[PDB]
Amino acid sequence: GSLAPLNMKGLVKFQDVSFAYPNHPNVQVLQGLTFTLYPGKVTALVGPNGSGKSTVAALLQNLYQPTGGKVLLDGEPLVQYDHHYLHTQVAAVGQEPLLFGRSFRENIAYGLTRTPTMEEITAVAMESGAHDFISGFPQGYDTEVGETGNQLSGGQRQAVALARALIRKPRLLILDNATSALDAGNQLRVQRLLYESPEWASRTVLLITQQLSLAERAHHILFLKEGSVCEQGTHLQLMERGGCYRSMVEA
Amino acid sequence: LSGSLAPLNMKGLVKFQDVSFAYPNHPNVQVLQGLTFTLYPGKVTALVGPNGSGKSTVAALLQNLYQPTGGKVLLDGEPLVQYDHHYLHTQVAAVGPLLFGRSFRENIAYGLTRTPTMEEITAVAMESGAHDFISGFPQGYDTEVQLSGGQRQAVALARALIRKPRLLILDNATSALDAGNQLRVQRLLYESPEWASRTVLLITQQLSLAERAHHILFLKEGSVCEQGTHLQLMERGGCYRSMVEALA
Ligand SMILES: Nc1ncnc2c1ncn2[C@@H]1O[C@H](COP(=O)(O)OP(=O)(O)OP(=O)(O)O)[C@@H](O)[C@H]1O
Ligand SMILES: Nc1ncnc2c1ncn2[C@@H]1O[C@H](COP(=O)(O)OP(=O)(O)OP(=O)(O)O)[C@@H](O)[C@H]1O
Ligand SMILES: [Mg+2]
Ligand SMILES: [Mg+2]
């Protein structure tokens, strides 16, 4: 399909979604999967290894389509949205991002549908915690970054990739173990970005992590087990119930 | 003298003595500077500190992937360069991707200087938390290597553990593991008799993991700012406490 609307809220709904990878049809990854990601909220997606969290992230980028049920963005099936329109409103960051371009400046601007100013580049780098280390180099943002950012440190890489996601001003930001290498100061910066920024209380965030301390301030938590939401709610609500989430935090 | 040592006995006592380092192709950036510490066998030593402080660089030097530009990296009192490269590979294992066209058993067995049994491979896979998902496949361990982030880390960990190295280096190696698997690995390192005599360097930004460590090294701008146990460092009121306070 062909949708590319001017205005977007960012309301995401999975409705009884099922999925198996195309070249492994008999292996159910997601099943009976239902949840809502509300606009301007941080929703955490947590659960055991192999439960399907990264697969959910992939469907949210329309990398694959559900085998059953519906994946909706503002009440419209995702598959109907323009490939490029989606690219502009949906941004995913993983644990080990590939950083294209020859310098920090090019790394951050890469993939953006326009030419940003250095002011804009600097702003998002300050938000992501990348600015300080970048500014420490003689050439600053024009310092050469080699072979897709593999000469940066683990956390420097994540900080740069996050800046690059932020400058797109996406309606849906997906963080998949994306801050696991950040130091405490930068992790704090990202907590402030997620929960104390005026821009991200209007945009919607899917936060996938094994570090449940990061998810405590989430507005909603989804606990995924064997491809479906076992339980969901706030940290305190889930802690009161005494189920999967409780057992994971206490462990 | 390079590559002449391969002793029958390795205590695994590691000493950095006044180590300096800049990467050969970026010589203007001093990464480590006057870096001194000791990793004792029978301890998990956590190496923590800000992004870019040089922690993964310390891991690379400990594998003899680069040489210090100043000072000494000693293993049982001898400079690392003096060990035979194959020998050092039997004694030192680092975990930080899997090999494309090989089976899971071949992936776990990879880098081992002998041929292990399926019982050997299964055992270590249960310890790392890779067993259940591998067993789920119809052909099991014979399946050719797609995996989740945590499953990949579990497989990479089993590969290192099966080498039974004297020095194990974990560089953010469990960041994708779930609570269950993270707990099992911790139990293995802190409770198993085999790891009780070995030396473990645990590099992590998850300060909770650093909390059980027998010793903690706080690295800042390529040098140790302070060190001790969690409870000692919390009392001192320095960089470590500031870091723990920021997260809390
Ligand atoms: N490209 C792929 N092709 C086939 N199977 C896949 C593919 N990617 C993932 N899988 C499988 O789908 C299941 C779900 O994987 P997924 O990566 O979504 O889990 P996860 O919850 O993100 O796990 P983790 O917490 O370890 O990251 C796993 O069993 C995995 O082996
Ligand atoms: N291969 C390389 N060539 C040149 N410089 C490098 C290389 N690898 C890392 N560096 C640089 O050396 C410095 C130390 O990086 P290192 O990865 O050792 O830090 P770290 O303490 O491991 O950081 P993090 O906590 O983010 O993982 C960084 O500023 C980094 O950009
Ligand atoms: Mg995943
Ligand atoms: Mg590192």
From Swiss-Prot, chain B:
Residue stretches making up the ABC transporter domain: 14-246
Annotated positions binding ATP: 49-57, 146-151, 205
Protein residues bound to Mg(2+): 56
Effect of residue 205 to H: Increases ATPase activity by 8-fold. Impairs ATPase activity
Superkingdom of the source species: Eukaryota
Location of this chain's protein in the cell: Endoplasmic reticulum membrane
Topological domains annotated Cytoplasmic: 1-248
Record text on subunit structure and interactions: Heterodimer of TAP1 and TAP2 (TAP1-TAP2). A component of the peptide loading complex (PLC), interacts via TAPBP with MHCI heterodimer; this interaction mediates peptide-MHCI assembly. Interacts with PSMB5 and PSMB8.
Domain notes: The peptide-binding site is shared between the cytoplasmic loops of TAP1 and TAP2. The nucleotide-binding domain (NBD) mediates ATP hydrolysis coupled to peptide translocation. Two ATP molecules are accommodated at distinct nucleotide binding sites (NBS) at TAP1-TAP2 dimer interface. Each NBS is formed by Walker A (GxxGxGKST) and Q-loop motifs from NBD of one subunit, while the NBD from the second subunit completes the active site by contributing the C loop motif (LSGGQ). Each ATP molecule is coordinated via the beta- and gamma-phosphates to a Mg2+ ion, which is necessary for ATP hydrolysis.
Protein family: Belongs to the ABC transporter superfamily. ABCB family. MHC peptide exporter (TC 3.A.1.209) subfamily.
Function noted in UniProt: ABC transporter associated with antigen processing. In complex with TAP2 mediates unidirectional translocation of peptide antigens from cytosol to endoplasmic reticulum (ER) for loading onto MHC class I (MHCI) molecules. Uses the chemical energy of ATP to export peptides against the concentration gradient. During the transport cycle alternates between 'inward-facing' state with peptide binding site facing the cytosol to 'outward-facing' state with peptide binding site facing the ER lumen.
Name recorded for this polypeptide: Antigen peptide transporter 1
